[PDB]
Amino acid sequence: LSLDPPRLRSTPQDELHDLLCVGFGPASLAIAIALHDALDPRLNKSAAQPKICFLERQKQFAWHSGMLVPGSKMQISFIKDLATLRDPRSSFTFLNYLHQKGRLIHFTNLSTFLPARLEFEDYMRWCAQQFSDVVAYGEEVVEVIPGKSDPSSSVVDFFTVRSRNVETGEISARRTRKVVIAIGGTAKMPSGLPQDPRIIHSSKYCTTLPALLKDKSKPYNIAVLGSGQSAAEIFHDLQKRYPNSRTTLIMRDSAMRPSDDSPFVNEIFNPERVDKFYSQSAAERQRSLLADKATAYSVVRLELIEEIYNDMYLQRVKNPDETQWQHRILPERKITRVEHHGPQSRMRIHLKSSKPETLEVDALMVATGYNRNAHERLLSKVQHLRPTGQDQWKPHRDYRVEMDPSKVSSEAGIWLQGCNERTHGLSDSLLSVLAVRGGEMVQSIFGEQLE
Amino acid sequence: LSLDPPRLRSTPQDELHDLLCVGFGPASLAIAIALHDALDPRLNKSAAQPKICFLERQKQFAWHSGMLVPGSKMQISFIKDLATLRDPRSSFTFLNYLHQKGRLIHFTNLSTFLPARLEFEDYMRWCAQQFSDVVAYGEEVVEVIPGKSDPSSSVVDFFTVRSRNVETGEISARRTRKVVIAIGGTAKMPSGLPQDPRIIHSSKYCTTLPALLKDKSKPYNIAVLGSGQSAAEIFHDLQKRYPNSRTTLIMRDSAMRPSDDSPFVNEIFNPERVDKFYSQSAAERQRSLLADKATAYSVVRLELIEEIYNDMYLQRVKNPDETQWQHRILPERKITRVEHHGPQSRMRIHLKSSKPETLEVDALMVATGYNRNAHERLLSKVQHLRPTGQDQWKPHRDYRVEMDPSKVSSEAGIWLQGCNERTHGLSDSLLSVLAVRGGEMVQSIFGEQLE
Amino acid sequence: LSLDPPRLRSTPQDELHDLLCVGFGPASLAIAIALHDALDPRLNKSAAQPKICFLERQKQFAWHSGMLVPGSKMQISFIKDLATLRDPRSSFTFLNYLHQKGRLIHFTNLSTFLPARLEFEDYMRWCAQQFSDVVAYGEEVVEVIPGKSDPSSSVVDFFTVRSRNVETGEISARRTRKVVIAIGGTAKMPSGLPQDPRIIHSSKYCTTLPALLKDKSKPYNIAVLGSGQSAAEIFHDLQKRYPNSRTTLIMRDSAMRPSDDSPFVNEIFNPERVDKFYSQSAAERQRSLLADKATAYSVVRLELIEEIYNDMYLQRVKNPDETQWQHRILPERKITRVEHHGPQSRMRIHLKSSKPETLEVDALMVATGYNRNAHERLLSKVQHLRPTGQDQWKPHRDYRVEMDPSKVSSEAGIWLQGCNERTHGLSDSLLSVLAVRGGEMVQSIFGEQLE
Amino acid sequence: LSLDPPRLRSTPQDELHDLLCVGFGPASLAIAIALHDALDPRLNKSAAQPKICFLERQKQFAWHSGMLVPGSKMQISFIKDLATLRDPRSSFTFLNYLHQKGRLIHFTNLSTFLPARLEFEDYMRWCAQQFSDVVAYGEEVVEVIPGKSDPSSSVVDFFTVRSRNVETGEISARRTRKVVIAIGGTAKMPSGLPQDPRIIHSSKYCTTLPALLKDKSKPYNIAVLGSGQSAAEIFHDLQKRYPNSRTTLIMRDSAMRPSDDSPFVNEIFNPERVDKFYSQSAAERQRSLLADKATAYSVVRLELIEEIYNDMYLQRVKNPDETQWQHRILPERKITRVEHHGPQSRMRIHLKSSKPETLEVDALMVATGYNRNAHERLLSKVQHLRPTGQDQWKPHRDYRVEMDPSKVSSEAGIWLQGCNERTHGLSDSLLSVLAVRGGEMVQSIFGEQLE
Numbered sequence A, B, C, D: 001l002s003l004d005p006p007r008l009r010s011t012p013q014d015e016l017h018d019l020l021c022v023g024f025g026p027a028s029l030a031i032a033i034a035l036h037d038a039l040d041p042r043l044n045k046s047a048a049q050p051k052i053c054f055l056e057r058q059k060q061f062a063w064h065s066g067m068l069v070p071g072s073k074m075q076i077s078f079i080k081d082l083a084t085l086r087d088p089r090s091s092f093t094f095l096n097y098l099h100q101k102g103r104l105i106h107f108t109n110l111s112t113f114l115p116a117r118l119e120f121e122d123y124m125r126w127c128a129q130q131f132s133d134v135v136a137y138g139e140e141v142v143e144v145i146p147g148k149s150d151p152s153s154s155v156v157d158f159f160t161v162r163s164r165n166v167e168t169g170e171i172s173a174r175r176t177r178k179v180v181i182a183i184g185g186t187a188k189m190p191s192g193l194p195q196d197p198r199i200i201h202s203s204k205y206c207t208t209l210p211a212l213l214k215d216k217s218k219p220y221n222i223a224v225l226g227s228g229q230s231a232a233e234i235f236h237d238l239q240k241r242y243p244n245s246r247t248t249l250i251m252r253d254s255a256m257r258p259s260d261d262s263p264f265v266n267e268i269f270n271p272e273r274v275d276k277f278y279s280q281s282a283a284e285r286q287r288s289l290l291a292d293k294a295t296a297y298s299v300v301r302l303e304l305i306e307e308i309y310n311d312m313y314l315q316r317v318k319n320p321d322e323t324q325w326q327h328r329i330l331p332e333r334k335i336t337r338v339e340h341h342g343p344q345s346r347m348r349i350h351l352k353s354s355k356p357e358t359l360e361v362d363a364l365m366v367a368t369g370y371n372r373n374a375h376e377r378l379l380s381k382v383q384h385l386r387p388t389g390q391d392q393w394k395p396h397r398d399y400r401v402e403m404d405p406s407k408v409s410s411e412a413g414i415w416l417q418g419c420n421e422r423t424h425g426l427s428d429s430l431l432s433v434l435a436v437r438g439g440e441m442v443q444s445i446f447g448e449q450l451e
Ligand SMILES: Cc1cc2nc3c(=O)[nH]c(=O)nc-3n(C[C@H](O)[C@H](O)[C@H](O)COP(=O)(O)OP(=O)(O)OC[C@H]3O[C@@H](n4cnc5c(N)ncnc54)[C@H](O)[C@@H]3O)c2cc1C
Pocket: A022, A023, A024, A025, A026, A027, A028, A055, A056, A057, A058, A062, A063, A064, A067, A073, A074, A075, A076, A139, A140, A141, A142, A182, A183, A184, A185, A230, A417, A418, A429, A430, A431, A432
């Protein structure tokens, strides 16, 4: 329909970069997009291109591909794509992507605000490919190291970012004034579960479970631990994927509970509300996160809850005896022990009540969420630049971490993205404010240059 | 279509009754209905009629008539009427009521499980009228007094129930072996608000607000305190009822939140789950009530939340300046003081944040819920019959309160209904289990007689 | 929960029956149920049992088992079950069935008026089994023959009904004063299609297609002709059932169109509207059937249309080239020729526009509806009893066919059920008015006896 | 948020224009917008401005303001605004309008594709105001007259457009090579109804009914003739607007029927389908319009049908006697005579069945649709330029009417918009394809200039 906008120019890796971004998921992608738009005279009247590079450990752009369950839907309006809430005229809107694919009229006839996760990933992939010249894939960042252009001074004014090539194992280094860490989360596992190849986090569902359970027709016993959106999607999907299997949903809560996207509550995810949340005290922020927990954690989309309920009711129609059901839910349970050294294909899972019985399974899917602390390890050698006494990174409103002013130049800095819920609200790890935040980040990072 | 079933026979008030029920709301009505069905040879094979009387302070049957807001809907499936979950063959089902009115086919074409509150009240009224011979209306019960058929013994074996005729003020007494107290709740007011005729509880909305604000066209300022279903219904309704008024919703929470009727959670209201809840410890029961709070308290029907949100959005369309809106919501506020002695028509309401500004209004609707402690006052003179040391009534699973066995005959007793959430679960004060509980109560109370 | 009501007594087959019913599908079942209720003193105050028998060719009760597609839903509110609109107190209501199965509370939490076809069939099966003593299964009726108790007179006053035992092939005869023919429809095939085992009517989908296509993993090509509810259900289901197959929906219309159950239109299915429809002239009845055609024929449930549309859109997401899609719709087409004598597994289907290209397929499902003329063949030897000149059976309002009064006794007669759309409206072949019609039929047939 | 794009320059009215557009409703507005975008180097790489003027008879931009009923909703996805389907990057998209108003995030939380008609009008108004320099309001075009730059030749190469200033009555003339007529429809009245100020077309509902019925509290009798979307909206609205009135919906059909926007059917409104429709024969086009009639004419939005049905059911709850209802529907009726010369405030409306009774009313709203023939009158003096024998204007695919090539220069022409259903399909008079058609029109009209 139209031509794609001009590509960003790559930078030789031996040159000092203006910005180096760790990760090229949605959060980094939104920053690339906002930078493109900011450098677009059509979009910004005022609009040399900044020297920028993105390091991504995956071999190409992918969005949670381990959980790309068939049928899985976005839990957010497509209007909250990577550009529209910042500038609906952007070439990087979902609607413009659809138009470019010749699909916009057909999507309109769906009357849905919620694309398949598959389609939304391809949207983001389609955006991502327009930045290929400035993204280095298959590069896993392993550390950020402070640098001094004047080694005999006591002022840091750049950082060296070292990454391991995931194919060759070789170590590269790139130097930059500013670093963004946007690396999402790491799998959270209950500390009571032993390491076993049959015990698999939800994040590796689509990738590593079919490797373990190769025959989709075989009568497997498969359990799912958890009662959030991932637990539900996996529990529901196993029933299609392995149709002769016996599945068990194990949860410490009494029920799957619906996610709250009711319109007054949902305004906590508005981009303008980040100022409001950020400015509250630590205590009020903690109470606020708790009060709105049903919008984000340990909750399932009502539609999916209802579909699973109907499936269970259909089992009840066929057999009033719940102990005989092919697919069962076991609420208010916790796993107290996992026998997993026996000769059998199966582990023995021992269960008790979760208030203050055994299953034998071929695999246990563990849908217990994510931690967002992995940036700490990347930043270990830059900790000493923090103000005296700090043992945590303190991100400012504009997401730049606080550093000792007498140790670090004002031209140099490190920003965090996607790990700042404590300071910036429940929207921080989601897609909800990426469009606007990208804009804010470009302004924060490239502000002098673009003025 | 069919004839109504045989009426129950009245009892002369000077005779010793088998059962005397205080209140003829839904809970008592469900007991009348279950008794009728139990005495129906068509419904119960095994089926002299028990001597029974109901005392109701209203002049005729009415169901929360002060909150019969136009458009107001049931928040419960009609299948949970006063008989169906006990016996769908009962003549007292909602569907059979519709058939009797010649309306069943038209209701079917609505495709709704949720009747207007108006229609459901008329259903219950239609049931209630079939018990007119055994209900004494306009009788307000004021005390229950222990009696001894042998005054020189130390055993109580009946109770005298005294009521005040609401029209004549005259005091009547009726004697009975067994008493049921089913009197619902009393208005809960925040203790910080002064008594004023302009400050009116939600329960008296339809009755006493139009008496105060007589001219529906006048530009009143009207506030609503609270963020539950009643606050919402009243806030929304005032906008139709007084179209030129300026309304303000004052709430200490940050948002109206949706009621949870998602299907797995909603099973806590199943009749069979009362056994389960009752048998849990006090501590587990407390934690359970807390965990499922969003099913019952401080929550609004999503549909109503969404309609109010749309109304506010339409105001935003007309004027981006929220300070100028005719109808406004003020979240995270508490009332710190109410000036109400000035010469003006209006009170001055002083507001502060509810985290750890003034309105001038013609009336303040206070939608802050109910207490369920009024039975305590009726039972003051029977307290001494409790086991030594008890300062609260302890209802058994079958809702009969515990009494000292050496002080009270096994043929005599007092049952509580609708005030037992602490011991019987969130369904206790609702319509949810009335059909089944009525059956259980008839069995508990009339069990010997019906065997 | 309760006990089942008393069984009806069987009749020795050599005795003259009061009523003999051909078929024990829903329509006959509704008559059995209404008769039971009419003989129930609990339900009818006024209430020797009539001598009745039902002849059904299937070996046991089954409801369209060839189209019991997984997930398939009722297209009618459960309130229009086989008794409720006549008498909601009946033991044969859907809700009472649920209660008897201990499932009523769980069904309530579905919040649906539309059961799975599987569940509704089991409801009807559960009803049907209560009449086992008076139903002879595996009996295919082949003719109805006039009888004269006085052979030398010219008055017919009974009929002999002869049936072929489907297992033994043996012929039985039973004599009766009154006959009901309630045998539903026969498969309508386009006259241009040749007989071939690979060409299968929708009615035999679940039974005879898996016999033909034994391996569910094989890449079959399967076509579906038609664009009604059956075509849609089969088209959608093949995609799950044979996941590697290539399916093609062939339709002469341009689109699947949604069924109209909007509430004002839907009142044509009200039981009371049959009087209104019946009394209109032939011309007005014809125009009326045409005007409301979108309620009944060549239409699909919006929900199913939307799901199929989403599946096609998902194919579009993966591949913009519709010619490469696994599952395709070909609108405005007609089949002009079917090569089916070649050596290949597959038939060659030749297509042209349907306005005034070839597929090779392993099977063609033909979803082109039903005829309702099979009663004509059963009644061939009784035609001469019609009034002079009639070449069609003329059913009165009460569904008794017109006969020459001087040739047939007033105590003898034949009623038609389910084939009377022309005279009684679009509800005649559906479940919509079975409850009320059953009552009317019992009154019409057994009226003298029950007075 | 961003600045508005550059304004188009006005043209002195004594200059020969490139394009003169009659009407500035949605269709003309979409052409203005597409022209702006085509001249935008940001949107079109290749991008002297054409000399253009729009003549609109209203004093300012308004969209069907006589039917801007409170609550009225768009019946089309906002994605089908005036630019998005052509170019989602356009500054004239609905989403960009929302962003400019600071409302985009709040609209997102509505989760609706269907704005209030009020909001969508303000969207279009907001677009329209950006073309104020080239629109002359209060100008009613009365004729288009052929011109010859060489009067002694036989070739027309311009047209003079004459308009009457609606305030001063003065006549202006403007000359142009090309003319677009985009003037929408004129009120269709049944020819059997007499002229009376109490008989008012739906198009003048919000403007001229409250002038007639000044007191909203008065017990008026008001009838509505028709059963389409307008009849329904007016019938429903009168009940709020005049709460003590008795309203009557008079319709020749038996029921309000729902509009078909089911997704396969709805593809007839796709912009790409205009090529397909246009190329079909006259006969096939006629049959096609008939087949899809339920998408466009004599149909009501299911949601509105359902709301009206619920209102009627609520009347039934209060009173089983339909003859006493405040608001009544009278189906299958036609008006045979209107007494309207009597002394009373009210007309007497005589009714009969519509198959092949009197009301006395204060006003009759006539909701019987529109004609689209008014361009004929404007073009009367240019008819002779058509090819010999034509008595109708024949619009080409690109909407330019056919003219004799030897009588009219190739640089001169007349285009029709919004009146071409017969040749271009059911989307022609709607908003459905305005975005794309605007683009096509700009290309058709300004094609040489923009190359
Ligand atoms: C199954 C699932 C469904 C979800 N659905 C939604 C939804 O519908 N709507 C919504 O708003 N949110 C949703 N989320 C939330 C999700 O967090 C955000 O949508 C989004 O993924 C966050 O973007 P991100 O860039 O911050 O993190 P990520 O998406 O995790 O991307 C971070 C990137 O950094 C790479 N990376 C990590 N470490 C390194 C390293 N050391 N070196 C180099 N590269 C590295 C990773 O490969 C990854 O690509 C969902 C999450 C999950 C798990």
